[PDB]
Amino acid sequence: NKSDAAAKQIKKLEEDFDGRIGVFAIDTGSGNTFGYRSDERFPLCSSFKGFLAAAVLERVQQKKLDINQKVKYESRDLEYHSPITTKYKGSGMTLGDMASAALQYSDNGATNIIMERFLGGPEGMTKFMRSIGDNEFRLDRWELELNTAIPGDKRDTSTPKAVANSLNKLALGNVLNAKVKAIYQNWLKGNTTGDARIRASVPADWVVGDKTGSCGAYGTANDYAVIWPKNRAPLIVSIYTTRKSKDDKHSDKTIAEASRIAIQAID
Ligand SMILES: *C(=O)N1C[C@H](NOS(=O)(=O)O)C=C(C)[C@H]1C(N)=O
Numbered sequence: 001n002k003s004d005a006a007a008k009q010i011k012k013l014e015e016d017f018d019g020r021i022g023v024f025a026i027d028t029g030s031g032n033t034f035g036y037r038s039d040e041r042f043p044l045c046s047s048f049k050g051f052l053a054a055a056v057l058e059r060v061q062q063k064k065l066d067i068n069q070k071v072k073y074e075s076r077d078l079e080y081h082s083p084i085t086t087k088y089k090g091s092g093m094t095l096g097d098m099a100s101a102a103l104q105y106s107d108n109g110a111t112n113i114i115m116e117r118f119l120g121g122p123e124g125m126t127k128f129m130r131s132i133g134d135n136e137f138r139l140d141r142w143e144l145e146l147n148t149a150i151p152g153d154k155r156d157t158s159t160p161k162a163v164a165n166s167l168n169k170l171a172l173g174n175v176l177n178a179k180v181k182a183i184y185q186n187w188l189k190g191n192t193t194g195d196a197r198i199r200a201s202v203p204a205d206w207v208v209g210d211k212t213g214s215c216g217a218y219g220t221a222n223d224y225a226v227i228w229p230k231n232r233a234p235l236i237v238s239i240y241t242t243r244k245s246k247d248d249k250h251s252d253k254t255i256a257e258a259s260r261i262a263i264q265a266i267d
């Protein structure tokens with residue numbers, strides 16, 4: 001019933017903006033799920049940086065990396081949108097700071113430095129995802145080439161369900177031990193780019209940790225969140241959108257609204 005009505009609303013929403021919305025949402029307290037195009041592929045854009053940070057933490061937990069190790073790059077030409085790395089260029093940053101910059105600010109320099117030195121590049125990032133049983137995820141290119149969002153291109157894509165499940169594994173499951181998962185969770189909660197997406201869809205008193213992506217082509221954008229309501233179990237929401245034309249702007253309000261609908265369906 002509620003599921004049928006939610007489906008109709010997403011559909012109207014995708015027609016209203018001549019685009020494509022994929023949704024997966026889970027109420028971890030009740031088991032309730034909702035999916036719309038949940039097994040279809042969508043560009044990840046910046047949203048994979050949330051997982052890159054999870055990979056970094058797993059490496060620290062396995063003791064291959066130290067969270068306070070210094071990462072120096074004084075002579076590295078930084079990629080476009082390196083707001084955090086560019087201010088620490090002189091002195092370097094700790095591993096954990098760079099990784100949380102990758103997540104919380106979408107820092108492209110942080111991203112590509114981490115993939116280059118600690119994670120084995122895009123194939124290594126893909127391998128990490130495979131290792132938690134995510135068969136859908138792939139990253140193939142570096143920042144910024146990975147953001148082309150060309151329709152019909154499987155490169156740098158995933159599905160909403162796989163995103164949701166993976167997040168549930170990393171933020172809520174036991175890939176990460178209690179102490180390291182707490183940190184990951186805090187990184188998610190302090191994300192600075194998601195105010196007009198999933199966070200906008202929920203009472204202000206609910207706690208959200210999220211990671212957004214905005215390819216800036218084909219109107220492509222997304223957000224995934226763990227959500228802690230008061231006196232209830234966490235929710236997981238995954239929202240992915242594209243648009244028909246290359247020049248199309250992304251719509252924060254469609255994302256926020258698809259989130260409202262996904263949440264109402266599962267609650
Ligand atoms: C990632 O997709 N980015 C980085 C930046 N952050 O906004 S986002 O977190 O919503 O993505 C902005 C972008 C337009 C995009 C990029 N530069 O690739």
Ligand SMILES: [Cl-]
Binds near residue numbers: 112116142
């Ligand atoms: Cl590179």
